[PDB]
């Protein structure tokens, strides 16, 4: 009895097996847009992955993750909240069974049928293990998706997810050029919280795209055929596999645009 995103083993339960699932600063959160302030002290984010060497694509039973090379400073974040710099380790998405849901961040309460999160960590702390225990351990950037016209650098993910439809399925993935998955404006919120999943570690600074990025029907449709479950296993499809809006508590979102 695992958790997942089903009635018996979802978000609701996750406190059991992870208290701190009811901490001060959990994800993700409803972004409200005229609440949050505009730091004019925040930087551009650098967004450098022209060097980014992608590996493989897994699905681990909760999402499918593209996996890079992080044993060198290749692709790395800096700038905008950050301090220092973060390697990209894997990027992956959250998504719905329908349009109107999937995302995890939310905006004036509106939900997006996808959320790519770019998964960075602190090269202060020499491994992803290590930076996860750290308040500034990590750094996941968060860019929504809404339906609409195709985005043409996201196929060839779409296209392999027939190869790693079950649970613990691998793929070799390698030349993706993740700058494909990017919208136009780099504007951004910020804000300190966590992993969104098990274990729920409070290690991440939060850098969530104003701009969403256009998917189509088509691609996100094949998201929804992938499955939860394990080869030889009842069909469960993965879908619905966001975590809902957390408590804000005391923290305060911040916006880099007026
Ligand atoms: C390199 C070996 C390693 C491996 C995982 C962990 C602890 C768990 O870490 C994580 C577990 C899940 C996630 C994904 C979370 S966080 C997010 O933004 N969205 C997710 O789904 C991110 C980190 N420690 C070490
Ligand atoms: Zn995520």
């Keep these: 009895h695992?958790?997942?995103?089903?009635?018996?083993?979802?978000?609701?339960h996750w406190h059991k097996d992870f208290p701190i699932a009811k901490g001060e600063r959990q994800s993700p959160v409803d972004i409200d847009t005229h609440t949050a302030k505009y730091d004019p002290s925040?930087?551009?984010?650098?967004?450098?992955?022209?060097?980014?060497?992608?590996?493989r694509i897994?699905?681990?039973?909760?999402?499918?993750?593209?996996?890079?090379?992080?044993?060198?400073?290749?692709?790395?974040?800096?700038?905008?909240?950050?301090?220092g710099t973060y390697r990209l380790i894997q990027f992956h998405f959250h998504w719905g069974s329908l349009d109107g849901q999937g995302?995890?961040?939310?905006?004036?309460?509106?939900?997006?049928?996808?959320?790519?999160?770019?998964?960075?960590?602190?090269?202060?702390?020499?491994?992803?293990?290590?930076?996860?225990?750290?308040?500034?351990?990590?750094?996941?950037?968060?860019?929504?998706?809404?339906?609409?016209?195709?985005?043409?650098?996201?196929?060839?993910?779409?296209?392999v997810l027939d190869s790693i439809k079950t649970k613990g399925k691998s793929a070799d993935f390698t030349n993706f050029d993740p700058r494909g998955l990017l919208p136009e404006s780099l504007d951004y919120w910020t804000y300190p919280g966590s992993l969104t999943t098990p274990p729920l570690l409070?290690?991440?600074?939060?850098?969530?795209?104003?701009?969403?990025?256009?998917?189509?029907?088509?691609?996100?449709?094949?998201?929804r055929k992938l499955?939860?479950?394990?080869?030889?296993?009842?069909?469960?499809?993965?879908?619905?596999?966001?975590?809902?809006?957390q408590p804000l508590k005391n923290r305060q979102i911040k916006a880099s645009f007026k």
């Design 2 to 12: 695992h958790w997942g995103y089903g009635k018996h083993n979802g978000p609701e």
């Design 202 to 223: 409070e290690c991440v600074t939060w850098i969530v795209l104003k701009e969403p990025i256009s998917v189509s029907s088509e691609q996100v449709l094949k998201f």
């Design 58 to 83: 897994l699905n681990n039973g909760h999402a499918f993750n593209v996996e890079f090379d992080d044993s060198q400073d290749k692709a790395v974040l800096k700038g905008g909240p950050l301090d």
């Design 103 to 159: 995302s995890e961040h939310t905006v004036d309460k509106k939900k997006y049928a996808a959320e790519l999160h770019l998964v960075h960590w602190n090269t202060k702390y020499g491994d992803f293990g290590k930076a996860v225990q750290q308040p500034d351990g990590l750094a996941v950037l968060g860019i929504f998706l809404k339906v609409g016209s195709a985005k043409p650098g996201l196929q060839k993910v779409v296209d």
């Design 227 to 245: 499955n939860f479950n394990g080869e030889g296993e009842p069909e469960e499809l993965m879908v619905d596999n966001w975590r809902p809006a």
């Design 42 to 55: 925040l930087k551009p984010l650098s967004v450098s992955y022209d060097q980014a060497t992608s590996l």
